[PDB]
Write a protein that binds this ligand. Structure first.
Ligand code: CL
Ligand code: CL
Length: 162
């Protein structure tokens, strides 16, 4: 297992524009297009992203290419973030993938806000951090995905994803 396969499981694959769990226009593998309520706006952002007149549909290949860019961006975003980097550096490979997933889901900013949990993770206090992470809107809105992540941080293995 790896970050790519992990997120592909959490996000699914859709080749036509869709609404995410928050009602935002998305496509491919969790690639957010816009927070705007307008579909044209979404269609526009999409064409701009792919580089062609797509009419709201893409191929698998195009989806994958957005995915690769997005994973890459998250990683780099972590490394540049002064709150995030030290955490990521302290972790093992499995747990690093969990952190990337969360950043991919909620953005750097969102994650950098889990101050307390971050600290606990850096400290390697696994169960405590798992309890703290669950006290969040994130957990209450997407509980099954959150439980997968939490197990992952707790255990350092991929069991939640097998
Ligand atoms: Cl883009
Ligand atoms: Cl969920």
């Amino acid at each position: 297992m790896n970050i790519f396969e992990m997120l592909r499981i959490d996000e699914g694959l859709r080749l036509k524009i869709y609404k995410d769990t928050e009602g935002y226009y998305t496509i491919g593998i969790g690639h957010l297009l816009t927070k705007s309520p307008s579909l044209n706006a979404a269609k526009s952002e999409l064409d701009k992203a792919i580089g062609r007149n797509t009419n709201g549909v893409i191929t698998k290949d195009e989806a994958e290419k957005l995915f690769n860019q997005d994973v890459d961006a998250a990683v780099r975003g972590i490394l540049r973030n002064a709150k995030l980097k030290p955490v990521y550096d302290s972790l093992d490979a499995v747990r690093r993938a969990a952190l990337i997933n969360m950043v991919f889901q909620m953005g750097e900013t969102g994650v950098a806000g889990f101050t307390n949990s971050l600290r606990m993770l850096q400290q390697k206090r696994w169960d405590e951090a798992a309890v703290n992470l669950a006290k969040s809107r994130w957990y209450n809105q997407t509980p099954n995905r959150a439980k997968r992540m939490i197990t992952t941080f707790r255990t350092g293995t991929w069991d939640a994803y097998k």
